[PDB]
Amino acid sequence: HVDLTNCDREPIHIPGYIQPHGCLIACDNAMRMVLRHSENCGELLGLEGDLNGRTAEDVLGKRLVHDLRNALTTTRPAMLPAMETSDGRSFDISLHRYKSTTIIEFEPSDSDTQPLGTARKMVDRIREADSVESLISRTTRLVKATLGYDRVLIYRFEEDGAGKVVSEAKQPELESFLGQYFPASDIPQQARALYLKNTLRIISDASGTPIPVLPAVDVSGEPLDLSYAHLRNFSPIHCEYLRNMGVAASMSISVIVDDALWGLIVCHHCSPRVLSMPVRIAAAMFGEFFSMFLQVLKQKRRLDTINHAHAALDRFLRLAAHRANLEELLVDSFQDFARLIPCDGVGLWVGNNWHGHGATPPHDAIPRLARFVASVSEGRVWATHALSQAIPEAEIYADTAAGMLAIPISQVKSDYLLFFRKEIVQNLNWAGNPEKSYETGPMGDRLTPRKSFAIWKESVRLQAQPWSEADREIAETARIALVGVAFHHS
């Protein structure tokens, strides 16, 4: 049994079933003996009776088995498009070895597509992108046009595991998910772990009858680990989700940046759809190249951001020299620091006087905040995205200021520069349709995009967009700049 109470702990790596668009044979470490096989090995390979106990050379043939052994020579599956069996039948074969068990996946052959050629055309069109936004927007559009899926999304993972739809290409009749968030629980930890091990992940048919593996558990009480198997069957929880959405097929591409799961390129189809091995090889290479280019562009953006901050602080220090009263200069210019760190408001607390700009807490609320900041600051940068978790009184003005970053501007006195952010739900640019409802199944209305979005909204209430490492790094450079020049003027 699997339900909404235990689906976060579901062992999705050992389902004991495969998808019907191919058949599976498991063999021993040295591919001599057949240990397990899929029920549908009978139909596709055209063999009689049980395969378990019989040798690899007996069941496949000496000719083929020799080539498979040679291909094994670390955990990445070997692709063998268009191999011939004994009778002559052509099959595309995926061969890998994990937990000293050799797995062999067969699907009907397709020799009418060139992987390198398809991939090169796609990678050329993204190679010359000069911004993250430009790469992201063009990629959904490009992948849709090339692989002909009804909908292509890019999800980006937030710090808290939540996913944001940052790009979309779809059929006009389908509803938009652009700007929508899903909760971390919508992709369990064991799913993120598999997504990090396999570039590609295919679901040919959400309504397809799953084929069992024989045996499901062997003599020593072990299940067959299908972590690296492309035929591994999908969770019935995700199955019902796709069925509820009207999605029949899917193919996800993992986006890996600084050896972390940045997000997914995900393709939905409203009818069943299996890509042939050669097309899957091209899509995988594209995914690998998309990941590398995004990594460099993220690196370039970080450098430009912090370079612009250094330039701005130099401009200010040049002014600070020619001007006699530094307090006077800060009062005139504090709003200009909003250019350094993304914020919805910024304020100056100097000589027990408050000056606000943009969305700040109310004038009467500032003294409490100032005294609190002085308490916990200890002459260093202090920052929260959940202001009411620190000061329960702050809940009342969360719609204006739910997040705060404090910069000390004096080594001696308790003067601060306060950056503010509105609660994250305020700044939403959701392009979806609230009138669109979804058909539910046995499990309930939890497995609908509508309910996923409502659960996320509840989780991030009274909270702002978290302060990034780049935000922190700029705040620290501004502290040293202001504390420094404040010391000089005394």
Ligand X SMILES: *C/C=C1/C(=C/C2=NC(=C\c3[nH]c(/C=C4\NC(=O)C(C=C)=C4C)c(C)c3CCC(=O)O)/C(CCC(=O)O)=C2C)NC(=O)C1C
Sites of contact with ligand X (CB under 6 A): 4, 7-8, 10, 12, 177, 182, 185-188, 191, 194, 234-235, 237-238, 241, 250, 252, 266, 447, 449, 452
| Contacted by 235, from ligand X, its own copies, none: CB < 5 to 8 Å by type | ligand X
Minimum CB separation of residue 285 from its own copies in Å reads 8
| Contacted by 130, from ligand X, its own copies, none: CB < 5 to 8 Å by type | none
161 sits in the region (left: phi over 0; alpha: psi -120 to 50; else beta) called left
| Complex with its own copies: residue 429 or 490, whichever CB lies closer | 490
Minimum CB separation of residue 487 from its own copies in Å reads 6
| Contacted by 74, from ligand X, its own copies, none: CB < 5 to 8 Å by type | its own copies
Residue with the shortest CB distance to ligand X: 7
| Contacted by 315, from ligand X, its own copies, none: CB < 5 to 8 Å by type | none
Q: Establish whether the linkage from the previous residue to 215 is cis, with ω within 30° of 0.
A: yes
342 sits in the region (left: phi over 0; alpha: psi -120 to 50; else beta) called beta
| Complex with ligand X: residue 20 or 345, whichever CB lies closer | 20
Separation CA 204–CA 341 (nearest Å): 45
| Contacted by 296, from its own copies, ligand X, none: CB < 5 to 8 Å by type | its own copies
Minimum CB separation of residue 294 from its own copies in Å reads 10
Minimum CB separation of residue 324 from its own copies in Å reads 17
157: which 2 tokens?
A: 């993972």
**Which 8-state DSSP code applies to residue 103?**
E
| Complex with ligand X: residue 182 or 228, whichever CB lies closer | 182
| Complex with ligand X: residue 265 or 366, whichever CB lies closer | 265
| Contacted by 33, from its own copies, ligand X, none: CB < 5 to 8 Å by type | none
Minimum CB separation of residue 483 from its own copies in Å reads 7
Q: Would you call 294 helix, strand, or coil by DSSP?
A: helix
- Residues 144/61, Cβ–Cβ less than 8 Å: no
Minimum CB separation of residue 148 from ligand X in Å reads 17
DSSP state string for 240-255: HHHHHHT--EEEEEEE
| Complex with ligand X: residue 390 or 443, whichever CB lies closer | 443
Residue 223: other Cβ atoms inside 10 A: 16
Main-chain dihedrals φ then ψ at residue 341, nearest 5 degrees: -120, 125
| Contacted by 12, from its own copies, ligand X, none: CB < 5 to 8 Å by type | ligand X
Residue 100: other Cβ atoms inside 10 A: 8
| Complex with its own copies: residue 86 or 295, whichever CB lies closer | 295
Measured torsion, CA atoms of residues 322, 323, 324, 326, in degrees rounded to the nearest 10: -130
DSSP state string for 330-384: HHHHGGGGGGTS--SEEEEEETTEEEEEES---GGGHHHHHHHHHHHHTTS-EEE
| Complex with ligand X: residue 177 or 467, whichever CB lies closer | 177
Whole-Å CA distances, 238 to 128, 289, 439: 36, 28, 14
Separation CA 253–CA 113 (nearest Å): 20
**Contact residues for 102 (Cβ-Cβ < 8 A; gap 6+):** 26, 27, 28, 29, 31, 72, 95, 96
Chain residues that interact with its own copies, rule: CB under 8 A? 74, 116, 120, 123-124, 127, 285, 288-289, 292-293, 295-296, 299-300, 303, 306-307, 310, 378, 411, 473, 476-477, 480-481, 483-484, 487-488, 490
Minimum CB separation of residue 190 from ligand X in Å reads 7
| Complex with ligand X: residue 1 or 363, whichever CB lies closer | 1
C-alpha 321: how far from its chain's center?
47
Separation CA 218–CA 29 (nearest Å): 15
Separation CA 48–CA 28 (nearest Å): 21
| Contacted by 471, from ligand X, its own copies, none: CB < 5 to 8 Å by type | none
Minimum CB separation of residue 477 from its own copies in Å reads 6
Minimum CB separation of residue 480 from its own copies in Å reads 4
Minimum CB separation of residue 9 from ligand X in Å reads 9
| Contacted by 449, from its own copies, ligand X, none: CB < 5 to 8 Å by type | ligand X
| Contacted by 241, from its own copies, ligand X, none: CB < 5 to 8 Å by type | ligand X
242-265: buried (b, 16+ CB within 10 Å) or exposed (e) per residue? bbbbebbbbbbbbbbbeeeebbbb
